PDB file of C-alpha atoms in Angstrom:
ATOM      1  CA  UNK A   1       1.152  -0.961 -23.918  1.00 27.24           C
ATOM      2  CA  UNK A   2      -0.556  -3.216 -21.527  1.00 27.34           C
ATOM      3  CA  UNK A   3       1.039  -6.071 -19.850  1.00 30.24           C
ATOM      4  CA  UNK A   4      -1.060  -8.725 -17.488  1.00 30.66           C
ATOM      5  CA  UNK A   5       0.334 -10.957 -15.103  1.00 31.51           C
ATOM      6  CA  UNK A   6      -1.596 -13.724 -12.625  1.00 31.31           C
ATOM      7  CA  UNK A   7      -0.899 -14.178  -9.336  1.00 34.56           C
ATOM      8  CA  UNK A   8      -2.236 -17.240  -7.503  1.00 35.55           C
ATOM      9  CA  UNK A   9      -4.424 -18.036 -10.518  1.00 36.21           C
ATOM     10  CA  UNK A  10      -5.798 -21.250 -11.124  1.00 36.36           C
ATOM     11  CA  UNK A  11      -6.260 -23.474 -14.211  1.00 41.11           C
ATOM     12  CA  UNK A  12      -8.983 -21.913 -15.770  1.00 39.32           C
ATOM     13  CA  UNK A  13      -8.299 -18.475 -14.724  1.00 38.98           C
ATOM     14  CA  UNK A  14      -4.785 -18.303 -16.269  1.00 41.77           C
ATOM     15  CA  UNK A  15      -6.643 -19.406 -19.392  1.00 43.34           C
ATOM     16  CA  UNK A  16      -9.070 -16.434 -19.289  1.00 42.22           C
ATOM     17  CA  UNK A  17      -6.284 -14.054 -18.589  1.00 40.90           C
ATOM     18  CA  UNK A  18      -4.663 -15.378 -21.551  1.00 42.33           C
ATOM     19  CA  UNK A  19      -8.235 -14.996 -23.237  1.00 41.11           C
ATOM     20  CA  UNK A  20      -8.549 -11.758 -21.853  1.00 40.90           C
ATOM     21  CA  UNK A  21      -4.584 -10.488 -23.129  1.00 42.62           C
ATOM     22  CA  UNK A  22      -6.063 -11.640 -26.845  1.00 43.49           C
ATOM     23  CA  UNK A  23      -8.873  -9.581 -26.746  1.00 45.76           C
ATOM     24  CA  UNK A  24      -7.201  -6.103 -25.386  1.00 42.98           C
ATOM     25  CA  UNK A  25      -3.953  -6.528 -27.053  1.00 42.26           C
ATOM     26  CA  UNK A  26      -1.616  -6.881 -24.257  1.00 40.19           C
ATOM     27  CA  UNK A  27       1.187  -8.849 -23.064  1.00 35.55           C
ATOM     28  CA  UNK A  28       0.348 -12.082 -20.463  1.00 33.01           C
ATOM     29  CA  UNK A  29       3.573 -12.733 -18.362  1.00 31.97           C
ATOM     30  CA  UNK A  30       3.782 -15.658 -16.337  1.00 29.87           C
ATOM     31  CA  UNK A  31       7.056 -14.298 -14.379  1.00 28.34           C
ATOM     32  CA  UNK A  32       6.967 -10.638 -13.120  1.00 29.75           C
ATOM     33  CA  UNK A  33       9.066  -7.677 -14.412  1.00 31.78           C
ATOM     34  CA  UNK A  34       9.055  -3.693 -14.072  1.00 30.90           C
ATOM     35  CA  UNK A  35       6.914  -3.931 -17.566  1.00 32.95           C
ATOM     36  CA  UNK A  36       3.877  -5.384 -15.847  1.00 34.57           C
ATOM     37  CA  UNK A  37       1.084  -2.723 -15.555  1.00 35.79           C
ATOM     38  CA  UNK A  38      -1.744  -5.321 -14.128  1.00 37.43           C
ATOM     39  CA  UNK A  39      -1.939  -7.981 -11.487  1.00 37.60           C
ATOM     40  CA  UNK A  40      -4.908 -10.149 -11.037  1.00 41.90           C
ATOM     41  CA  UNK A  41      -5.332 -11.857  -8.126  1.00 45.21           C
ATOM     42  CA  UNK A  42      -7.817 -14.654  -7.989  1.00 44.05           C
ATOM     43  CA  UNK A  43     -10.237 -13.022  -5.893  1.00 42.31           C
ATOM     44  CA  UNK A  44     -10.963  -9.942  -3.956  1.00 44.04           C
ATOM     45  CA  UNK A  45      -7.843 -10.168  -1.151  1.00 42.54           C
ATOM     46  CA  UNK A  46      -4.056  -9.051  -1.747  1.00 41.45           C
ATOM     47  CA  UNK A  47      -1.421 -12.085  -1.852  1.00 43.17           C
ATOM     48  CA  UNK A  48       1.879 -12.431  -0.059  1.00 44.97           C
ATOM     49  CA  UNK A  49       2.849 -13.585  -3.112  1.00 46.58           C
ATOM     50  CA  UNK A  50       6.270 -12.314  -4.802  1.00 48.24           C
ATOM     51  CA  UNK A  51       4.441 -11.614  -7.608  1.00 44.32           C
ATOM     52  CA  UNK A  52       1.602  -9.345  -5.571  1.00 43.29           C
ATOM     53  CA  UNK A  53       4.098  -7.906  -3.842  1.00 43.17           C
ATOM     54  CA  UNK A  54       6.328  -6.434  -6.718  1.00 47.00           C
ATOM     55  CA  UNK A  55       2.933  -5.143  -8.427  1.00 44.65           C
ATOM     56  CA  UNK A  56       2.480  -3.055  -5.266  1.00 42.46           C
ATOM     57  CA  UNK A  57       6.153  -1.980  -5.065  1.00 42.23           C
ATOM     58  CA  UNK A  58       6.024  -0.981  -8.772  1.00 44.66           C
ATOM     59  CA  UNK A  59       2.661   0.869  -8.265  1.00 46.01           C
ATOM     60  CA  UNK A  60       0.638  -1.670 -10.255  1.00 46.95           C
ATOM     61  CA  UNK A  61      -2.897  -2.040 -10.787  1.00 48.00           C
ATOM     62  CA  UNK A  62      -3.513  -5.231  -8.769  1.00 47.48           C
ATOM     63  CA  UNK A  63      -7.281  -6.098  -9.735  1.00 45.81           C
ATOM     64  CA  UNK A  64      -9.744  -8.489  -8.214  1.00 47.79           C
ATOM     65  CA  UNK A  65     -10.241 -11.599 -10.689  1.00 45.63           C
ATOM     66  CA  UNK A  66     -14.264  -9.987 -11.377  1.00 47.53           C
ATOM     67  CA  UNK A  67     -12.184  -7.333 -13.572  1.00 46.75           C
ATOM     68  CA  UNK A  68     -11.231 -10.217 -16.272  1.00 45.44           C
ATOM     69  CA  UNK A  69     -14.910 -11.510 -16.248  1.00 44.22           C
ATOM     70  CA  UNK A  70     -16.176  -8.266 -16.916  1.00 41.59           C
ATOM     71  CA  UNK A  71     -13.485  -7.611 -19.608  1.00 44.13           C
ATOM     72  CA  UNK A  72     -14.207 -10.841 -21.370  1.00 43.59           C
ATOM     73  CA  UNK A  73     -18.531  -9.950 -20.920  1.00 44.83           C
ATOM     74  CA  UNK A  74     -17.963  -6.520 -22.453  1.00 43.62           C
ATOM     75  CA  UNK A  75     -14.982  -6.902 -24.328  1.00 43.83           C
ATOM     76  CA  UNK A  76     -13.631  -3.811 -23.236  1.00 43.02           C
ATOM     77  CA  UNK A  77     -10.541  -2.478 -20.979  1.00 42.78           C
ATOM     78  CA  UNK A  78     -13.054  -2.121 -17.792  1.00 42.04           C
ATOM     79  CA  UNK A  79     -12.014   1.174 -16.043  1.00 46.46           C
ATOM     80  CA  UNK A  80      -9.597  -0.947 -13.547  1.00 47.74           C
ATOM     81  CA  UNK A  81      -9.644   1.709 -10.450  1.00 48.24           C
ATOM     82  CA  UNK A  82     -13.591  -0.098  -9.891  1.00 49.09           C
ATOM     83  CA  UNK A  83     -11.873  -3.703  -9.557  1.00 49.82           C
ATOM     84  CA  UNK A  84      -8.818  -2.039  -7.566  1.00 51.37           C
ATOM     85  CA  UNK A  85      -8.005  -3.867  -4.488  1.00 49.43           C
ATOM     86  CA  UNK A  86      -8.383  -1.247  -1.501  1.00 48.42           C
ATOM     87  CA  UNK A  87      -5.774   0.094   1.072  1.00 47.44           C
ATOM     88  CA  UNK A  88      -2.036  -1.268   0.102  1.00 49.33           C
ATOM     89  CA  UNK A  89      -1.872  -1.496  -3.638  1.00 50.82           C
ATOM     90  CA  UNK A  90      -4.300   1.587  -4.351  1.00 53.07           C
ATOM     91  CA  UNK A  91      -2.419   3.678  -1.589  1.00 51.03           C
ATOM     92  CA  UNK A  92       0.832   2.734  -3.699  1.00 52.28           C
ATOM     93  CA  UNK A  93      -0.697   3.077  -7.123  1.00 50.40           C
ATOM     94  CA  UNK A  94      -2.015   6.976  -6.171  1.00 50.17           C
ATOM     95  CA  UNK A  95       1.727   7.084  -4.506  1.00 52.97           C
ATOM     96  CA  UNK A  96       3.023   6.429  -8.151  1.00 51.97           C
ATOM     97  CA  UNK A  97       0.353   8.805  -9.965  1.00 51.54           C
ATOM     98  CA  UNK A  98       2.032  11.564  -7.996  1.00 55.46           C
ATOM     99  CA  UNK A  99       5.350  10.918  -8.533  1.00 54.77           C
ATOM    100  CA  UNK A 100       5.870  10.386  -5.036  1.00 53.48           C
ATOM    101  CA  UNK A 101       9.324   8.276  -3.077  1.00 55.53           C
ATOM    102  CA  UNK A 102       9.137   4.583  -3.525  1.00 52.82           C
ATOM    103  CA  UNK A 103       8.190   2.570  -0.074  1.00 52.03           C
ATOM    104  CA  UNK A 104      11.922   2.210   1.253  1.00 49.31           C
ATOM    105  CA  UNK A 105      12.919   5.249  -0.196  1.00 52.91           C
ATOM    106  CA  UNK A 106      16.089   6.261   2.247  1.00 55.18           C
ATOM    107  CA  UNK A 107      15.742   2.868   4.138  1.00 54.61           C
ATOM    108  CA  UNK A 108      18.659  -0.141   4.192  1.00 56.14           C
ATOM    109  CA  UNK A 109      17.964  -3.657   4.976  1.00 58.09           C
ATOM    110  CA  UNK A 110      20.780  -6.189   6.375  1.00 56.87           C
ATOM    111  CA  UNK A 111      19.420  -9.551   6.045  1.00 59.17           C
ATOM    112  CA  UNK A 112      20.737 -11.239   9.206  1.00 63.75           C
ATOM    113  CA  UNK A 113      21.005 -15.182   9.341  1.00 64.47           C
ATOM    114  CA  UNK A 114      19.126 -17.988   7.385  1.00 62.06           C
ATOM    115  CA  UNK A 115      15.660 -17.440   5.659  1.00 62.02           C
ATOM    116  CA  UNK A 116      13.355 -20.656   5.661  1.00 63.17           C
ATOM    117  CA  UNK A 117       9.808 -19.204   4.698  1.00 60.79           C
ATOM    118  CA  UNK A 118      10.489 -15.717   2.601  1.00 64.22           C
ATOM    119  CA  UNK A 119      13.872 -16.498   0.607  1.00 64.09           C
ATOM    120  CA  UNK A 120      16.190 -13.899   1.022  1.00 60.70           C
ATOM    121  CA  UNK A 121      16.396 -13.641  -2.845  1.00 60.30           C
ATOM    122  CA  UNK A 122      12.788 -12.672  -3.066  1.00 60.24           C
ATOM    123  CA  UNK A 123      13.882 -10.513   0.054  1.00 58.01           C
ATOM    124  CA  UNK A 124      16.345  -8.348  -1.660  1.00 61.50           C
ATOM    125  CA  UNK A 125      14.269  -8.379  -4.950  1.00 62.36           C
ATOM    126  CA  UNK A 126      11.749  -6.633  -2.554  1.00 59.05           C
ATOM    127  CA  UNK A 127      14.470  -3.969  -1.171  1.00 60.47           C
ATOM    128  CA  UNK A 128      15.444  -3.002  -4.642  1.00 58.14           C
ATOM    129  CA  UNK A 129      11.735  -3.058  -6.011  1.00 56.72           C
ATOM    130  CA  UNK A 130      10.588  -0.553  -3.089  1.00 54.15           C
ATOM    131  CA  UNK A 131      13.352   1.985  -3.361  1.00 57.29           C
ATOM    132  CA  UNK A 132      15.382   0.338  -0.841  1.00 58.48           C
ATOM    133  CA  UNK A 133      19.204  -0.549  -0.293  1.00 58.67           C
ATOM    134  CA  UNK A 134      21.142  -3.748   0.582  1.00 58.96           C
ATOM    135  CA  UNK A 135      23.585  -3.600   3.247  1.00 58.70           C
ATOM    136  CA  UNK A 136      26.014  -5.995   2.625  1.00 60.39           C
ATOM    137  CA  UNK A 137      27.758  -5.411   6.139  1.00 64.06           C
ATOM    138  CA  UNK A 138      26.100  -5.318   9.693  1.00 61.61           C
ATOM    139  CA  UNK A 139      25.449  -2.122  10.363  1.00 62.78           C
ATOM    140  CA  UNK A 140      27.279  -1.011  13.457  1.00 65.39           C
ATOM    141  CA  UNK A 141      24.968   1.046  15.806  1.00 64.45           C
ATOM    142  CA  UNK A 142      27.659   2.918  17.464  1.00 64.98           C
ATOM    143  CA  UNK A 143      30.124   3.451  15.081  1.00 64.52           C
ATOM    144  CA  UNK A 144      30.251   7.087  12.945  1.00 61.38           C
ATOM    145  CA  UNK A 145      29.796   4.682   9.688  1.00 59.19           C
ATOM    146  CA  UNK A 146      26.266   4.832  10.357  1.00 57.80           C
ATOM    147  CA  UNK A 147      24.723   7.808  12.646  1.00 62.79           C
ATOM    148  CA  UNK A 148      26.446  10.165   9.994  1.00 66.25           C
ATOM    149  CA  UNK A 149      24.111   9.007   7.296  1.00 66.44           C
ATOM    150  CA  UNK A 150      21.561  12.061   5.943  1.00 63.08           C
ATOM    151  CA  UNK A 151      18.856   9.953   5.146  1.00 62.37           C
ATOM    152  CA  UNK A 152      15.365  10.186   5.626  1.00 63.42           C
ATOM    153  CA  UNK A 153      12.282   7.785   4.900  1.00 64.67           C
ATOM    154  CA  UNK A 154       9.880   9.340   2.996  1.00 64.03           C
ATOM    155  CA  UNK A 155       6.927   6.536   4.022  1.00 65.63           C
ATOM    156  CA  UNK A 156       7.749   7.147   7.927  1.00 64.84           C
ATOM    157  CA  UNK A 157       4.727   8.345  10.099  1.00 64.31           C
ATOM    158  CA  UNK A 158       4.585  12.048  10.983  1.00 61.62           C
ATOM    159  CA  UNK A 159       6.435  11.318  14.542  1.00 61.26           C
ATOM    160  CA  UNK A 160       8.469   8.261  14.201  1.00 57.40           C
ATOM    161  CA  UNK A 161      12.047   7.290  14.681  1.00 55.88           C
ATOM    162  CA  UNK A 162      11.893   5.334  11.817  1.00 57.10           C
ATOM    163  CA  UNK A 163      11.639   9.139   9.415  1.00 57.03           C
ATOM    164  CA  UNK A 164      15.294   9.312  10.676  1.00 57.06           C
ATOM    165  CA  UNK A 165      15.880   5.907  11.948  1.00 54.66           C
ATOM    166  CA  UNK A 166      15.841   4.112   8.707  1.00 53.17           C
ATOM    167  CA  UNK A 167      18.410   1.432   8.472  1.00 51.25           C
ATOM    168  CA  UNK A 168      17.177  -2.687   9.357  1.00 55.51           C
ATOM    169  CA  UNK A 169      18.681  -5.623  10.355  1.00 53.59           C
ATOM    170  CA  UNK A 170      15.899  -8.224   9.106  1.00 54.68           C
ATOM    171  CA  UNK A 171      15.926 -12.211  10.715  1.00 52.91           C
ATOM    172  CA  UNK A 172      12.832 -14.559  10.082  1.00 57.67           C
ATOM    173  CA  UNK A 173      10.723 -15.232  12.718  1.00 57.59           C
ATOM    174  CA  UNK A 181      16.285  -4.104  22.266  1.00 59.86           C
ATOM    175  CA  UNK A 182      14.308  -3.356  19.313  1.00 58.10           C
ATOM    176  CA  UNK A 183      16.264  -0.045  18.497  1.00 59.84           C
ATOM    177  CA  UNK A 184      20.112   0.986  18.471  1.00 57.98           C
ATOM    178  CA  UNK A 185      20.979   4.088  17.427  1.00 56.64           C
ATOM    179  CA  UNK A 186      19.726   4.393  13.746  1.00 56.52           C
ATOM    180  CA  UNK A 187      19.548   0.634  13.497  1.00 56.48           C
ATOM    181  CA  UNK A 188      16.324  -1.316  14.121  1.00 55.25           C
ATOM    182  CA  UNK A 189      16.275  -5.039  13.959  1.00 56.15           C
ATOM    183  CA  UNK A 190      12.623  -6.231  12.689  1.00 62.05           C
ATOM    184  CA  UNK A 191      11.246  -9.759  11.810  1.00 62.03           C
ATOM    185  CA  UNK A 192      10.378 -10.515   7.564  1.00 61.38           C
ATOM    186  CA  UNK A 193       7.121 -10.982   8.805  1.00 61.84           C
ATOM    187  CA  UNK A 194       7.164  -7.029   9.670  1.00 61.38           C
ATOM    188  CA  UNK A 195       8.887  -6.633   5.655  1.00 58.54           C
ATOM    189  CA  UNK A 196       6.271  -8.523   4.283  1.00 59.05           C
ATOM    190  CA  UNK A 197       3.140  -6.723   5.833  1.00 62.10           C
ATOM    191  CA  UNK A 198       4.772  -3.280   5.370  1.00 58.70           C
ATOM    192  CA  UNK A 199       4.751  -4.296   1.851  1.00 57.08           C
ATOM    193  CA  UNK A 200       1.143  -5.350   1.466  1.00 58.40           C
ATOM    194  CA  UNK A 201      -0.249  -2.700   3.091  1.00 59.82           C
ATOM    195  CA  UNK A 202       2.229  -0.320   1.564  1.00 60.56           C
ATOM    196  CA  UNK A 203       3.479   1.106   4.855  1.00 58.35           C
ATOM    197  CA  UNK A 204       6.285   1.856   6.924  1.00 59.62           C
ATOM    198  CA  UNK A 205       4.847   0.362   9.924  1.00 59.68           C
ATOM    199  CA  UNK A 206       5.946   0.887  13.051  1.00 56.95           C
ATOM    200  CA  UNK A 207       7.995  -0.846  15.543  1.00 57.84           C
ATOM    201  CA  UNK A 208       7.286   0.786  18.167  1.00 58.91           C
ATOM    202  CA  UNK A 209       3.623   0.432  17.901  1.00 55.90           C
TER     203      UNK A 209
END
């Protein structure tokens, strides 16, 4: 069935979620798992929040917080797509109504050095979430271990390296070697909210 989950929510708000979960018959979560179905975020703007972020990797609904009030006023599952944040999580949503390749499909991710701001736990979580894989070796530009590789990345723009070019060393805060681009979690984290493969180039 249904399963809610809050992102960001405050004291109140978590409250009439869990009002809200009463009244439709559905599951409130406080931590996120591939069940979830709904994300409400406390207002009307996507999070960089783990929890956001994971909605719109698993092709969520991720609804403005106006969806629970209006739930609670008519006591009714509100048609969601009219509360739908625009652009990254609706983008990703349709992306999952059509059966389409997750985000990252055919993209790998090295996660070079120390991560202060986005833990490289919620990192990798994100990797595996978007269809991605871990590298658990540097990959080495000019070596046959890695310009032999088939892949391509589903997500890429028409005329980008990155369609063919599609493996990443990520740090935190020469951009290209061979099929190897190395790309700031800052870079991650917005292709994720705006569910893009953004480029690198541009």
């Amino acid at each position: 069935p249904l399963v809610l989950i809050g992102s960001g929510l405050s004291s109140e708000q978590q409250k009439m979620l869990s009002e809200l979960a009463v009244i439709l018959k559905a599951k409130k979560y406080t931590e996120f798992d591939s069940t979830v179905t709904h994300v409400v975020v406390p207002g009307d703007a996507v999070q960089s929040t783990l929890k956001c972020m994971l909605g719109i990797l698993n092709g969520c609904w991720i609804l403005k917080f106006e969806w629970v009030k209006a739930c609670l006023r008519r006591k009714v599952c509100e048609q969601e797509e009219k509360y739908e944040i625009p652009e990254g999580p609706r983008r990703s949503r349709l992306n999952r109504e059509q059966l389409l390749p997750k985000l990252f499909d055919g993209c790998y991710f090295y996660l070079w050095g120390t991560f202060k701001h986005h833990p490289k736990d919620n990192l990798i979580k994100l990797v595996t979430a978007g269809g991605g894989q871990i590298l658990s070796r540097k990959p080495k530009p000019d070596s046959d271990v890695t310009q032999t590789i088939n892949t391509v990345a589903y997500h890429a723009r028409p005329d980008s390296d990155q369609r063919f070019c599609t493996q990443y060393i990520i740090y935190e805060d020469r951009v290209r070697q061979g099929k190897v681009w190395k790309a700031p979690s800052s870079w991650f984290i917005d292709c994720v909210m705006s569910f893009e493969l953004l480029p690198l180039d541009s």
